[PDB]
RNA sequence: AGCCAGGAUGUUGGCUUAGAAGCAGCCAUCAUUUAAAGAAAGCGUAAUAGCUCACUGGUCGAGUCGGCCUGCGCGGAAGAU
């Protein structure tokens, strides 16, 4: 289905996660098999409109990180408590 | 944007109903009313005739791009188009059939083989015989040329000998 | 001038027009007696099945004279008569009644072919099937 | 005129207008729908 | 909005002049009128006049839209005027004219003395109908409205003054 | 957006209903015609009607429509020297 573009995480921890969301982005992770987990950051509103579709979970998507494209499937999502805005998402390699 | 496939269905039809038709009539009517919707549309089914309402914006691109002998100026503004595809002796009558069943003053133009025929010139063409009338008109034309001229001449010289 | 109303709808049984509330909105407001209407209507509409309510349009003039013109009876009344049912289901689709054949449904379509805008008799036969759905009548080939 | 709240569109003819800087209901078909409160 | 930047067209036998923030206009009927509007810059060429907002007035071109609409009514004021007819229906309340003063029945013991200012002319064919001409839409509309201040059509039989038109379809008394 | 013109048919669908209608209520909510029309959202006629909306065409000439995320305003906000 989709194709999206992201950066590697700049900074981690309790304040840095909210500072990323104040910068109109949110954190995510990519894992799978015996390969190491990769942490990333990406923009909210465009990815939220894709994530609202069944096709984001029922089939694979591609993601660009460090200028290279890799194929993934979505695993899990976290949201804010007052409105459904994406707090964090999980992917697996496909 | 009428060229989009969802709107293109009426765009592609003008090539058949305005240029490709055997006879056509064009009128300034913005809508047909219940009376013409009920009877005039249904009367056309037995005559080989059909009719539809068409948008100006479509025609500004369609009748200007399509080659027409003076007919395309009558497709400016709203248009009721009425047309026929077969049997010339019935098809050509559409201008008179419109003027009988509907308001004759709403007609902008009338056409044959997809080309304009002026309202002062189409009169005989819209009075044309059907196949079974035309073979009778041929026998009558052969009679008029052979005997008719002479019996008309005999009656005229008779009437000229009554006078003083 | 006509002064009074023209081409007002009514539905009425020929030679059986006794009750006055079901005609008052068309005839009684225009000073026309149901007996005076019926002695004209049952003589000019004698050929139909008298038990069926015929749809008519009526017109009344400034001198209290009047004129009327008929339609063919309702497609749901023709379907009721053809299926042999006492009534339609009154809760259609969810509940259904009777049966009618497609050969009889085409005769109802031919009965309405002089009174509908249609271009083909099979297409008008599907129009009568659309009425059969609304009365909850079963239709089968 | 009524107070209440929420400038209620009680019929299709209720236009809803700003007058003297406050939100109001105005209606020509039903003058009972004259209301001065959001 | 689109019209706030569009030209007003100047009629035949009408003359218009601009003076920074001021419009001056002349012709027939109203013959001469003038208005100030600080919120707009004005432009003119032969058969047209155009507006646009000045600094601090630029929001939505709204005052240029107002100025366009106003001068579009002034070209008619210097051509033929407005509010051409007024009437009355009812139980002998009357609507007529004497000089510039309205002639009518009172119900009150003292006269209500409705009258027309300078730049408005009126005549009456009956004691129920008046034909009117005026130099501008607001001045004639305002005095036509003052003549219906208490004499507006009532809610149950609709009797009163009408501006040759009305909105009172009426209703009926309590509970049937 | 406004303004101007059209705004179908089977069919006053079935059942009920004082009687009852697109619009008093409940149920169906179909098919054909068709530029086009919910077996009608709202108005409305003794009522069948009729009029808007919905739906279609014109007129005219550049921007425009609704929702979402999010900041600010207004009123809501009546008390005793």
Swiss-Prot record, chain A:
CDD domains found in the cross-reference section: Ribosomal_L25_TL5_CTC
Superkingdom: Bacteria
GO CC terms of this entry: cytoplasm; cytosol; cytosolic large ribosomal subunit
Coiled coil stretches, renumbered: none
One Pfam family it belongs to: Ribosomal_L25p
Stored InterPro entries: Rbsml_bL25/Gln-tRNA_synth_N, Ribosomal_bL25/Gln-tRNA_synth, Ribosomal_bL25_short, Ribosomal_L25_dom, Ribosomal_uL5_bac-type
Gene Ontology biological-process annotations: cytoplasmic translation; negative regulation of translation; response to radiation; ribosomal large subunit assembly; translation
GO terms of molecular function: 5S rRNA binding; structural constituent of ribosome
Keyword terms of this UniProt record: Ribonucleoprotein, Ribosomal protein, RNA-binding, rRNA-binding
Chain's role: This is one of the proteins that binds to the 5S RNA in the ribosome where it forms part of the central protuberance. Binds to the 5S rRNA independently of L5 and L18. Not required for binding of the 5S rRNA/L5/L18 subcomplex to 23S rRNA.
Summary of subunit composition and partner proteins: Part of the 50S ribosomal subunit; part of the 5S rRNA/L5/L18/L25 subcomplex. Contacts the 5S rRNA.
Family: Belongs to the bacterial ribosomal protein bL25 family.
Protein name: Large ribosomal subunit protein bL25
From Swiss-Prot, chain B:
Molecular function GO terms recorded: large ribosomal subunit rRNA binding; ribosome binding; structural constituent of ribosome
Pfam families reported in the protein's UniProt record: Ribosomal_L10
UniProtKB keywords: Acetylation, Repressor, Ribonucleoprotein, Ribosomal protein, RNA-binding, rRNA-binding, Translation regulation
Modified sites of kind N6-acetyllysine: 36, 104
Domain of life assignment: Bacteria
InterPro entries cross-referenced by the UniProt entry: Ribosomal_uL10, Ribosomal_uL10-like_sf, Ribosomal_uL10_bac, Ribosomal_uL10_bac_type, Ribosomal_uL10_CS_bac
Cellular component terms (Gene Ontology): cytoplasm; cytosol; cytosolic large ribosomal subunit; large ribosomal subunit
CDD domains xref list: Ribosomal_L10 (cd05797)
GO annotation (BP), single: translation
Function: Forms part of the ribosomal stalk, playing a central role in the interaction of the ribosome with GTP-bound translation factors.
Miscellaneous note of the record: Ribosomal protein L8 appears to be an aggregate of ribosomal proteins L7/L12 and L10.
Subunit description: Part of the ribosomal stalk of the 50S ribosomal subunit. The N-terminus interacts with L11 and the large rRNA to form the base of the stalk. The C-terminus forms an elongated spine to which 2 L12 dimers bind in a sequential fashion forming a pentameric L10(L12)(L12)2 complex. Two L12 dimers associate with a copy of L10 to form a very strong complex (called L8).
UniProt record similarity statement: Belongs to the universal ribosomal protein uL10 family.
HAMAP family in UniProt: Ribosomal_uL10
NCBIfam families, per database record: PRK00099.1-1
This protein's name: Large ribosomal subunit protein uL10
Organism: Escherichia coli (strain K12)
Gene: rplJ
Swiss-Prot record, chain E:
SUPFAM superfamilies, per database record: Ribosomal protein L6
PROSITE patterns in the cross-refs: RIBOSOMAL_L6_1 (PS00525)
Molecular functions (GO terms): large ribosomal subunit rRNA binding; structural constituent of ribosome
Residue(s) carrying N6-acetyllysine: 43
GO cellular component: cytoplasm; cytosol; cytosolic large ribosomal subunit
Signal peptide: none
Keyword RNA-binding set for record: yes
InterPro entries for this protein: Ribosomal_uL6-like, Ribosomal_uL6-like_a/b-dom_sf, Ribosomal_uL6_a/b-dom, Ribosomal_uL6_bac-type, Ribosomal_uL6_CS
GO BP annotation list: cytoplasmic translation; response to antibiotic; ribosomal large subunit assembly
Keywords: Acetylation, Antibiotic resistance, Ribonucleoprotein, Ribosomal protein, RNA-binding, rRNA-binding
A Pfam family that the UniProt record links to this protein: Ribosomal_L6
Family: Belongs to the universal ribosomal protein uL6 family.
HAMAP family reported for this sequence: Ribosomal_uL6_B
Subunit: Part of the 50S ribosomal subunit.
Family matches, as PANTHER family: 60S/50S RIBOSOMAL PROTEIN L6/L9, LARGE RIBOSOMAL SUBUNIT PROTEIN UL6M
NCBIfam families assigned to the protein according to its UniProt record, in alphabetical order: L6_bact
Function summary: This protein binds directly to at least 2 domains of the 23S ribosomal RNA, thus is important in its secondary structure. It is located near the subunit interface in the base of the L7/L12 stalk, and near the tRNA binding site of the peptidyltransferase center. Gentamicin-resistant mutations in this protein affect translation fidelity.
Listed name of the protein: Large ribosomal subunit protein uL6
């Amino acid at each position: 289905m989709f194709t999206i573009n992201a950066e590697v995480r700049k900074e981690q921890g309790k304040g840095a996660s909210r500072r990323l969301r104040a910068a109109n982005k949110f954190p995510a992770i990519i894992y799978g098999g015996k390969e190491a987990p990769l942490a990333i950051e990406l923009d909210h509103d465009k990815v939220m409109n894709m994530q609202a579709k069944a096709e984001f979970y029922s089939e694979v998507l591609t993601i660009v990180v460090d200028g290279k494209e890799i194929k993934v499937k979505a695993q899990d999502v976290q949201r804010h408590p007052y409105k459904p805005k994406l707090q964090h998402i999980d992917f697996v390699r496909a | 944007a009428l060229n989009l496939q969802d709107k293109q269905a009426i765009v592609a039809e003008v090539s058949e109903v305005a240029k490709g038709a055997l006879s056509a009539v064009v009128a300034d009517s913005r809508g047909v009313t219940v009376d013409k919707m009920t009877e005039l549309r249904k009367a056309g089914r037995e005559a080989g005739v059909y009719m539809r309402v068409v948008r100006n914006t479509l025609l500004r691109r369609a009748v200007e791009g399509t080659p027409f002998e003076c007919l395309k100026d009558a497709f400016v503004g709203p248009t009721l188009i009425a047309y026929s595809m077969e049997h010339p002796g019935a098809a050509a009558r559409l201008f008179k059939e419109f003027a009988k069943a509907n308001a004759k003053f709403e007609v902008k133009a009338a056409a044959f083989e997809g080309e304009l025929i002026p309202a002062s010139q189409i009169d005989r063409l819209a009075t044309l015989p059907t196949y079974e009338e035309a073979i009778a008109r041929l026998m009558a034309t052969m009679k008029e040329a052979s005997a008719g001229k002479l019996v008309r001449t005999l009656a005229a010289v008779r009437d000229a000998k009554e006078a003083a | 001038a006509k002064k009074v109303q023209a081409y007002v709808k009514l539905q009425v049984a020929a030679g059986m027009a006794n009750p006055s509330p079901p005609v008052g909105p068309a005839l009684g407001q225009q000073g026309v007696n149901i007996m005076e209407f019926c002695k004209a209507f049952n003589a000019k509409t004698d050929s139909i099945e008298k038990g069926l309510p015929i749809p008519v349009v009526i017109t009344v003039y400034a001198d209290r004279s009047f004129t009327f013109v008929t339609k063919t009876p309702p497609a749901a009344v023709l379907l009721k008569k053809a299926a042999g049912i006492k009534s339609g289901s009154g809760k259609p689709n969810k509940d259904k009644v009777g049966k009618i054949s497609r050969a009889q449904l085409q005769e109802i379509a031919q009965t309405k072919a002089a009174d509908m805008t249609g271009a083909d008799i099979e297409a008008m036969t599907r129009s009568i099937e659309g009425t059969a759905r609304s009365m909850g009548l079963v239709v089968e080939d | 005129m009524k107070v209440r709240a929420s400038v209620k569109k009680l019929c299709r003819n209720c236009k809803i207008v700003k007058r003297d800087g406050v939100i109001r209901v105005i209606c020509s078909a039903e003058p009972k729908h004259k209301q001065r409160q959001g | 909005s689109r019209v706030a930047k569009a030209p007003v067209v100047v009629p035949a036998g009408v003359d218009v002049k601009i003076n920074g923030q001021v419009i001056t206009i002349k012709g027939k009927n109203g013959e001469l009128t003038r208005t100030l509007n600080d919120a707009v810059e004005v432009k003119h060429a032969d058969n047209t006049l155009t507006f646009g907002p000045r600094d601090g007035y630029a929001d939505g071109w709204a005052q240029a839209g107002t100025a366009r609409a106003l001068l579009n009514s002034m070209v008619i004021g210097v051509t033929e005027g407005f509010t051409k007819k007024l009437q009355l229906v009812g139980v002998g309340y009357r609507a007529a004219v004497k000089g510039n003063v309205i002639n009518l029945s009172l119900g009150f013991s003292h006269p209500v003395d409705h009258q027309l200012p300078a730049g408005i002319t009126a005549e009456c064919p009956t004691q129920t109908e008046i034909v009117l001409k005026g130099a501008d839409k607001q001045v004639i509309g305002q005095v036509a409205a003052d003549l219906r201040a208490y004499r507006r059509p009532e809610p149950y039989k609709g009797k009163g003054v009408r501006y040759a038109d009305e909105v009172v379809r009426t209703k009926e008394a309590k509970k049937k």
